Design a protein around this ligand. Structure first.
Ligand code: CDL
Ligand code: CDL
Ligand code: PLX
Ligand code: PLX
Ligand code: PLX
Ligand code: PEE
Ligand code: ADP
Lengths: 56, 104, 98, 44, 122, 320, 49, 347, 459
């Protein structure tokens, strides 16, 4: 019973998948701009004993 | 032919109310019309307006206005406790400025 | 440069002016084109002989060869023009505008 | 109520040999439908 | 007007010199390759549309060949473009190094000791 | 391998298929003459392919399924109402004449394609060469305007110059009173309204323009009504003709290649039928054009190219 | 349904389809192999691995 | 014409162009030009008629005069330096004569007069060849001698070509003359940047060739040579008119379309040489080409013109001959702006 | 920022693969969801902008404009589906595709970090608008309108391009952050004067400045309803935003290069408000009102003060909403009676009471009734202008009067009096039209509760 309704309603996930993919690509783009992570004179900080990065 | 061309006559615009007395003005098909009305009302009035207005109303203070008020309070307290002026006309310390030596 | 070089260059200039300034007959313009080829042959031959550049003694001959091609080409076109109008007048070539 | 579309009077503006006809160019004729001009009776 | 055609040691029609192999090749998920594949897909869709075929469904093998050809050409195009830009920067750096008197390193002043004219807005 | 320049370079030629029986034959005559029977009998005796006279829906029989389409999507003209009201102010008369000329051009292209591809001869009733007689009658009876005649002449001039006229032109002669008697006899209520002036104009057009002009470049066989039934005699007369007059002997492999590249590709054949001359009789406005084109595209096998319509059972579309 | 030859019939031209798919597959395999060799040569020349 | 003879003539035209573009000797470049012209004349007359004969005669007269001037310039250069190599002309008079001969061969103003007429007199396939392949050889020669060209003369001719192309195209109802005036304007754009950067010249040439091939193929597909004939195409092939409208917008140089990329790259390059007035005038003048492209798009795709009854019959038939490279050509003519940096591969 | 761009791009295959009777529903629902997602860009920092990547960044100036664009798409879809019902499926999908492409170009335009990318998207917005106007406009004048819309823009923008590349040759960059941090004064020279003109006149044409505004009445009148909505609500602001970005390199030249534009804006604001008093076409009146409001925005940007920049931002947002609502209101009556003559259909309050209430609220926001954001922006600009020179109030106050005079005039002409007797086809308002009016008007009123969210970076 779900085959035909899926075949006529699968276009309803295109935009949510686009949103999720855009969020993923924003995170990937963030990964390329970490040259000054925990290195600014204003926010430079000693790491906690367990954390590896201040932000990601 | 006393005529210039073979043309369709301009048709009269049809009233959506004639076949659907409660027609909502969205579509000729009554079911599609009702569902178009329902999705418009739910996703505009229920989702975007109300929830979006609530979300914008409770946005965290990233503009740092309460922070600025607290900082100003601290500065005013310290400065009028010690007799210092509340503000200085010089934004930067003159000791780190190197003016040209001769003005004439 | 000697008077002969300027005489050959003047001959080329005269033939080019004759080609550019048309009269009725297309054959006269073809003759002006052939005259330009002849002047080029003479000038290049004089330069090559004067400088004793041995291997370009063949280039004027090749020049002549392609001259013939042009001539043949032009004559062919003239035939068609005549077959359309009964004359070789350049006035008849006015079906196409700018 | 329908959208306006070009009619014959509108279309004939583009049927001349040139746009913007002048007194000189009004006598210019559009080329034949096929690119073939009628033969001239230039008997030899 | 012709900048790099006469560069010494340049083979006429290689399209991809040996030294270009010293550069990291573009990733297969490069966004430029993805755009090239998108161009191939659009070419396939237009081919369906012109031939009056069902645009999205008609030639799956043909659409696949369009996409594959575009991606295949784009890979080598990107390699050559990256190599040319690397050559440009290599030559620029070498020339700056070999001409110190034309690119002098001057002592830089701080803003507290540079006099900038102030223009009021009123 | 579809025929083209590559097929011509290696192998295929046209002159090697001609077998003295190519003989494009047209069997003309006035309205209600028995030229159709004679044409079919000639085709049967000589072993040639017969082409029934091209009507309004001739093109429909060559495309999709051979079933005729609705008159609104094909033709947009009626012969019945041309007989009813030949002077209607809706332009039906010249629309019918121009559509019929286009159909006859398409049929001539099809017949020439068959002859040039297989070598087998073809038989036709009328042609693009004899269509004009109807036009002339239409003009002399006040049924069409002079502008319609000028447009028809333009289209004929740019179309008929590209083809070879028939080898054999057969004319069936029946006098006008006999034609009227046969028409009354047939029983068609619409054809009974044909006046004697119309038939006489058709007869005059034939005998004063068509046959004299065909005799200059072809061989013409005229036959009376009584001697028209003797198909054996007609075939014997055809078999003893010397085709030494027209351009057909003056054709070689290259002109045949050009002609065969033209006769296929029906769009190129029909190119000049829709030239932008804006006569009210044939001009159709943008709104009606759009509506009728959409209605045509909604037909069961016309949305896509022939092998790509899955609503008429086409399969493996994703792999084509 | 249709009246005449209609060169594309119910069965598609399998030789042409096979050639098209084979060309696509060959190009893809060649591109993958070329990228692998390019990466290996770049790492060897620049001493990464 | 016999198909084998036609193939031989086409390959001879191509061989003349290749001879021009692979030779280091001036005589061989001249021979390549002669061979190209000799094989080119019959291609223009393939469809015999008085108009084709007149077009071929005008073309041959123009190209033969240009060839005479070119050989004269070669001989003068040899006289003032015993050199046959195509590097840099040693005599300024010889350089001026060579520049004028190459401009006459290309059809740059004021030697543009022959380009519309010839293009009107030949078929659409001959026009495609004439407006795409015939530009390669003179432009390659100009690229090889770019350092020697006098900028004032070349820039004057380029600006005149752009202006005259726009103004002449404004007046045209025939599509072949429109394409010819478009070609003249684009040639002016190409030759304007030649003294500064030959890579930009090559990029503009490639982009213009792609768009011109797309337009000529679309015009052959919808066998229209006039505006009114093209106004019928919406009622038979709407997709063709839509693609033509997009390609016309690209030819006008509007962003984000590909046709914007050459001008954008040229103006920018000129600004690296302290040239602002000429790029500003060049763009403001290319507005005219955009105007008459827009007028053609109005008549062809953005509105619907009246049609004819017999068009119904054309609804029943498909196109017999299919163009393999038309889809790739359209896509390249429109959607390649994001790949602009790839132009570095052209130097 | 891709979390906004990619769903907008996904709108295209979604509408091209939807069922014939589902295109409007799907497009409306998903554009509304995209607007909800874009609403998260309103969280701004103060000190500096949100720099997502090298290519895209968001500011307190960009974010309200982005939200307005994403919100305007569903309203345009709602307003378009009535008069496009008879259209074929493919042409309806093409219309929706034009709208989606326009939104995509505008969204990328408002967030581009680099001025050449901004310019390219700024020009790219032209093509969908031109196609919409010249393909789906109703009258024969649309073609001419399209030409006017095109060559006015390009004749302004082509010099800007030249200036831009020239700048990158001397500065070395066109990144807006670098441009702002490394900004240097412009000397008093002819070359600097012409570079200033090349940098300014494109945005001047887009506003449009009085005297360069003739394209706007044509283009807005002849366009279909969605075209008019996007042209007035968002496209005009492309000028203002552009100016607010480019004046950072034009000091101190703007101190005297701005006098002719200020004079043109003030006098032509008076002129266009006065033109509104004698107008027979209802859409033309709305177009000229837009011209007057944009003249006030030009004054605000030219005087270069924090109060003027804040007022210009607020007025841009408020005018976008109000002008879109007014165009939709006029289109309802046009679809009723198929004429744009204002005096043809009268006394409509008797026949359509709720639509009369919508008309009244739109007219109130048009004349800047407190405490609407229209008056917030107008008052901020007027106070800044008074500081610039005290005589400006004379013109500003005059404008205010004339504005009210024509606003209520429109209201009195179409709603009051007696109904026209022979017009008997005025059907009751559809739920779609009432919902469209509400979705215009309610966000405008809610913005009063949180004005800072539209006050811009200078807040
Ligand atoms: C570029 C891309 C596409 C290029 C080829 C399109 C050619 C075409 O004609 O399209 C028709 C085709 C529909 O035709 P059809 O359904 O076969 O039926 C045809 C009708 O019977 C009737 O169709 P028709 O052909 O008979 O109608 C003719 C129509 C045909 O004219 C056109 O179609 C204009 C095209 C140019 O022209 C007109 O109607 C005249 C109107 C004049 C308007 C002038 C403006 C046109 C220029 C605007 C172009 C804008 C850019 C492209 C927009 C999208 C176009 C599809 O469009 C499509 O459906 C294809 C578009 C893309 C869909 C596939 C996308 C991928 C699938 C979803 C997966 C998601 C991806 C990500 C995965 C993530 C994981 C979840
Ligand atoms: C000030 C009073 C405060 C009351 C507290 C509660 C207020 C709740 C109102 C909520 C917002 C209204 C929604 C707008 C669309 C209307 C919906 C509708 O279709 O109505 C049909 C509905 C059903 O009736 P029906 O019999 O089925 O048929 C109706 C017919 O169409 C025929 O209907 P009609 O002829 O009877 O007309 C309907 C009505 C509706 O039409 C309108 O014109 C109302 C819209 C107001 C003008 C908007 C543009 C002007 C700029 C002002 C911006 C204010 C925004 C503030 C924040 C808003 C938050 C959403 O028009 C009027 O009654 C005359 C309007 C004249 C009001 C002039 C206001 C000037 C400034 C007043 C103070 C504003 C700031 C307050 C704080 C200041 C310092 C303490 O009728 C009503 O319920 C009447 C609406 C209520 C009247 C509101 C008047 C004042 C409220 C203004 C904003 C509220 C501020 C709240 C903050 C606390 C104070
Ligand atoms: C029709 C029937 C009529 C009769 C019935 C009437 C019933 C009563 C109606 C009247 C109600 C009056 C309410 C008055 C407002 C009271 C509440 C108000 O003050 O809330 C504000 C909050 O308002 C919001 O901040 C602003 C709402 C913004 C709405 C945006 C809508 C979403 C966008 C939609 C698209 C827009 C496109 C264009 C955008 C530019 C206050 O914010 P603030 O005092 O600071 O907050 C302090 C405490 N916080 C911080 C914890 C919250
Ligand atoms: C519309 C977009 C442009 C389309 C262009 C047509 C695309 C099809 C072309 C087919 C590609 C094959 C051509 C080259 C293959 C091997 C030959 C190679 O060895 O040639 C080299 C040359 O390499 C080629 O030039 C590379 C061609 C790549 C062109 C792409 C640039 C397009 C600009 C950016 C737009 C994005 C296009 C998207 C692609 C689909 C030799 O260099 P060299 O002999 O020393 O240069 C001679 C000229 N000089 C000396 C005067 C400089
Ligand atoms: C329909 C609306 C369209 C938009 C209108 C845009 C308006 C743009 C107008 C530009 C405003 C000022 C431009 C330049 C500033 C000063 C201009 C000049 O008149 O001032 C004097 C300039 O002196 C002379 O007057 C020279 C200018 C006279 C020659 C120009 C022709 C002006 C005639 C009007 C033409 C119409 C222009 C608009 C065409 C549409 C000042 O003398 P001086 O301080 O020593 O020189 C200053 C310049 N320096 C510093 C570089 C040396
Ligand atoms: C809707 C209609 C809008 C019309 C807009 C037209 C005005 C646009 C402004 C001028 C356009 C071209 C300006 C070029 C870009 C400036 C970049 C620059 O700085 O170059 C100048 C050069 O400036 C110029 O050459 C520009 C001169 C003008 C050339 C074209 C004249 C066109 C008519 C001039 C007046 C019209 C312009 C204003 C019109 C206002 C709008 C109506 C300096 O460069 P250098 O050569 O290196 O000199 C450095 C040492 N001083
Ligand atoms: N070109 C034409 N124009 C107008 N009417 C035509 C044309 N051709 C045929 N007709 C009509 O079609 C009918 C059948 O044609 P006809 O050959 O005379 O009869 P049949 O073939 O059945 O013996 C006749 O009424 C004839 O008038």
């Amino acid at each position: 019973n779900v085959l035909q309704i899926v075949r006529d309603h699968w276009v309803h996930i295109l935009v949510p998948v686009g949103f999720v993919f855009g969020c993923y690509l924003d995170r990937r783009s963030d990964e390329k701009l970490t040259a000054f992570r925990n290195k600014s004179l204003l926010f430079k900080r000693e790491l906690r004993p367990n954390e590896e990065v201040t932000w990601k | 032919p006393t005529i210039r061309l073979q043309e369709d006559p301009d048709p009269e615009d049809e009233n959506l109310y004639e076949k659907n007395p409660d027609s909502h003005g969205y579509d000729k098909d009554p079911i599609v019309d009702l569902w178009n009305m329902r999705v418009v009302f739910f996703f505009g009035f229920s989702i975007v307006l109300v929830l979006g207005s609530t979300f914008v109303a409770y946005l965290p203070d990233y503009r740092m206005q309460e922070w600025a008020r607290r900082e100003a309070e601290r500065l005013v307290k310290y400065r009028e406790a010690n007799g210092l002026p509340l503000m200085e006309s010089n934004c930067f310390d003159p000791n780190k400025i190197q003016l040209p030596e001769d003005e004439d | 440069m000697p008077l002969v070089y300027m005489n050959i260059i003047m001959a080329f200039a005269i033939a080019l002016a004759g080609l550019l300034m048309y009269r009725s007959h297309l054959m006269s313009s073809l003759l002006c084109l052939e005259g330009m080829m002849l002047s080029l042959f003479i000038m290049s031959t004089l330069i090559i002989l004067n400088t004793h550049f041995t291997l370009a003694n063949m280039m004027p001959i090749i020049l002549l060869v392609f001259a013939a091609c042009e001539a043949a080409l032009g004559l062919s076109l003239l035939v068609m023009v005549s077959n359309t109008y009964g004359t070789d007048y350049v006035q008849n070539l006015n079906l196409l505008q700018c | 109520a329908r959208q306006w579309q070009p009619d014959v009077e509108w279309a004939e503006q583009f049927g001349g040999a040139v746009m913007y006809p002048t007194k000189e160019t009004a006598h210019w004729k559009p080329p034949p439908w096929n690119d073939v001009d009628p033969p001239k009776d230039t008997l030899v | 007007m012709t900048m790099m055609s006469g560069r010494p040691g340049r083979v006429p029609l290689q399209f991809l010199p040996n030294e270009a192999r010293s550069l990291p090749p573009p990733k297969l998920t490069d966004p430029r390759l993805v755009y090239m594949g998108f161009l191939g897909y659009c070419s396939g869709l237009i081919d369906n549309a012109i031939r009056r075929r069902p645009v999205v469904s008609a030639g799956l093998h043909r659409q696949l060949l369009y996409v594959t050809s575009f991606v295949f050409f784009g890979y080598y195009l990107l390699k050559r473009q990256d190599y040319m830009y690397a050559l440009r920067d290599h030559d620029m750096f070498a020339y700056v190094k070999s001409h110190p008197e034309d690119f002098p390193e001057k002592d830089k002043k701080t803003y507290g000791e540079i006099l900038e004219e102030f223009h009021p807005v009123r | 391998l579809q025929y083209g320049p590559l097929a011509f370079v290696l192998g295929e030629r046209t002159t090697r298929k001609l077998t003295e029986t190519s003989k494009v034959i047209t069997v003309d005559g006035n309205i209600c003459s028995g030229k159709g029977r004679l044409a079919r009998e000639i085709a049967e005796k000589l072993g040639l392919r017969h082409f029934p006279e091209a009507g309004i829906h001739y093109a429909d029989s060559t495309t999709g399924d051979g079933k005729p389409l609705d008159v609104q999507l094909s033709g947009n003209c009626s012969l019945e109402k041309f007989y009813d009201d030949p002077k209607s102010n809706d332009g039906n008369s010249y629309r019918l004449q121009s559509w019929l000329y286009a159909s006859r051009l398409l049929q001539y292209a099809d017949a020439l394609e068959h002859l040039l591809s297989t070598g087998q001869g073809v038989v036709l009733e009328r042609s693009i060469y004899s269509d004009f007689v109807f036009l002339e009658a239409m003009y002399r009876q006040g049924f069409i305007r002079k502008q319609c005649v000028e447009h028809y002449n333009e289209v004929k001039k740019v179309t008929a110059c590209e083809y070879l006229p028939p080898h054999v032109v057969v004319y069936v002669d029946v006098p006008v009173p006999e034609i009227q008697s046969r028409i009354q006899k047939k029983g068609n209520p619409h054809e009974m309204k044909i006046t004697a002036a119309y038939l006489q104009d058709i007869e005059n057009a034939y005998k004063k323009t068509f046959l004299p002009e065909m005799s200059e470049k072809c061989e013409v066989l005229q036959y009376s009504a009584r001697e028209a039934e003797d198909a054996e005699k007609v075939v014997e007369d055809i078999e003893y003709l010397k085709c030494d007059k027209g351009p057909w002997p003056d054709q070689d492999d290259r002109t045949f290649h050009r002609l065969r590249m033209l006769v296929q590709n029906k769009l190129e054949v029909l190119n000049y039928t829709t030239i932008p001359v804006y006569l009210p009789e044939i001009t159709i406005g943008a709104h009606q054009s759009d509506r009728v084109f959409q209605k045509f595209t909604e037909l069961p096998g016309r949305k896509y190219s022939p092998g790509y319509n899955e609503d008429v059972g086409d399969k493996w579309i994703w792999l084509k | 349904k249709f009246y005449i030859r209609e060169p594309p019939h119910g069965s598609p031209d399998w030789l042409k389809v096979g050639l098209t798919l084979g060309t696509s597959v060959f190009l893809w395999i060649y591109l993958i192999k070329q990228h692998k060799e390019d990466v290996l040569e770049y790492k060897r020349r620049n001493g990464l691995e | 014409m016999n198909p084998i003879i036609y193939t031989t003539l086409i390959m001879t035209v191509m061989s003349g162009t290749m001879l021009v573009m692979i030779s280091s000797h001036w005589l061989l470049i001249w021979i390549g030009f002669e061979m190209n012209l000799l094989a080119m004349i019959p291609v223009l007359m393939k469809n015999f008629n008085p108009r084709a004969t007149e077009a071929a005669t005008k073309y041959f007269l123009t190209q033969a005069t240009a060839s005479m001037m070119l050989m004269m310039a070669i001989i003068i250069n040899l006289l003032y330096s015993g050199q046959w190599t195509i590097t840099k002309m040693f005599n300024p008079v010889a350089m001026t004569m060579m520049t004028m001969a190459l401009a006459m061969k290309l059809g740059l103003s004021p030697f543009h007069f022959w380009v519309p007429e010839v293009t009107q007199g030949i078929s659409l396939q001959a026009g495609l060849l004439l407006l795409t392949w015939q530009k390669l050889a003179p432009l390659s020669v100009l690229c090889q001698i770019s350092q020697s060209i006098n900028p004032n003369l070349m820039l004057t001719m380029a600006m005149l070509s752009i202006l005259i192309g726009g103004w002449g195209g404004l007046n045209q109802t025939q599509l072949r003359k429109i394409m010819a005036y478009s070609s003249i304007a684009h040639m002016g754009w190409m030759t304007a940047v030649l003294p500064y950067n030959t890579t930009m010249t090559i990029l503009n040439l490639l982009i213009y060739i792609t768009m011109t091939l797309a337009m000529f193929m679309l015009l052959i597909h919808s066998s229209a040579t006039t505006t009114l004939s093209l106004s019928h195409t919406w009622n038979k092939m709407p997709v063709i008119t839509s693609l033509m409208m997009v390609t016309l917008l690209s030819m006008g140089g509007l962003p984000p379309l590909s046709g914007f990329m050459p001008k954008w790259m040229i103006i920018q390059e000129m600004t690296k040489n302290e040239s602002i007035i000429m790029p500003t005038l060049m763009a403001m003048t290319a507005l005219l080409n955009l105007y008459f492209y827009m007028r053609l798009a109005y008549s062809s795709s953005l509105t619907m013109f009246p049609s004819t009854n017999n068009m119904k019959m054309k609804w029943q038939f498909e196109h017999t001959k299919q163009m393999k490279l038309l889809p790739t050509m359209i896509v390249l003519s429109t959607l390649v702006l994001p790949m602009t940096p790839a132009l570095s591969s052209l130097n | 920022m891709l979390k906004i761009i990619i769903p907008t791009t996904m709108l295209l295959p979604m509408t091209w693969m939807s069922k014939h009777n589902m295109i409007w529903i799907n497009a409306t629902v998903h554009s509304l969801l995209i607007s909800l997602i874009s609403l998260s860009l309103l969280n701004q920092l103060g000190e500096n902008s949100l720099n997502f990547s090298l290519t895209f960044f968001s500011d307190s100036l960009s974010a309200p404009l982005l939200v307005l664009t994403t919100w305007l798409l569903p309203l345009m879809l709602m307003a378009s589906q009535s008069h496009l019902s008879k259209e074929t499926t493919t042409r309806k999908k093409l219309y929706i595709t034009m709208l989606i492409l326009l939104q995509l170009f505008l969204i990328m335009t408002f967030t581009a970090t680099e001025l050449i990318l901004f310019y390219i998207l700024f020009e790219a917005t032209l093509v969908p608008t031109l196609i919409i106007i010249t393909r789906w406009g109703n009258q024969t004048e649309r073609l001419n309108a399209g030409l006017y819309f095109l060559f006015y823009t390009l004749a302004g923008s082509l010099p800007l391009l030249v200036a831009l590349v020239y700048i990158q040759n001397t500065t070395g960059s066109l990144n807006f952050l670098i441009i702002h941090y490394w900004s240097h004064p412009l000397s008093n020279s002819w070359s600097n004067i012409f570079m200033w003109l090349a940098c300014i006149m494109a945005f001047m044409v887009k506003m449009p400045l009085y005297g360069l505004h003739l394209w706007l009445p044509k283009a807005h009148v002849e366009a279909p309803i969605a075209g008019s909505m996007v042209l007035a609500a968002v496209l005009l602001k492309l000028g203002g935003y552009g100016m607010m970005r480019i004046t950072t390199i034009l000091n101190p030249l703007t101190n005297y290069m701005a006098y002719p534009f200020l004079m043109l804006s003030m006098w032509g604001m008076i002129m266009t408000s006065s033109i509104c008093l004698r107008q027979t076409d209802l859409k033309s009146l709305i177009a000229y009102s837009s011209v007057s409001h944009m003249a006030l925005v030009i004054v605000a940007i030219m005087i270069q003060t924090p109060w003027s920049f804040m007022g210009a931002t607020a007025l841009m947002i408020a005018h976008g909403l109000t002008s879109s609502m007014l165009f939709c209101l006029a289109n309802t009556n046009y679809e009723r009676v198929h004429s744009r003559t204002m005096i043809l259909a009268r006394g409509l309050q008797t026949l359509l009471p709720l639509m009369a209430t919508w008309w009244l609220v739109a007219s109130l926001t048009n004349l800047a009734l407190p405490p609407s954001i229209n008056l917030i922006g107008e008052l901020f600009i007027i106070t800044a202008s008074f500081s610039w020179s005290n005589i400006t109030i004379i013109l500003m106050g005059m404008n205010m009067m004339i504005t009210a005079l024509y606003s209520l005039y429109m209201l009195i002409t179409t709603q009051r009096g007696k109904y026209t007797h022979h017009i008997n086809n005025i059907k009751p308002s559809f739920t779609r039209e009432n919902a469209l009016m509400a979705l215009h008007i309610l966000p405008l009123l809610l913005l009063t509760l949180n004005p800072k969210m539209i006050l811009g970076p200078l807040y």
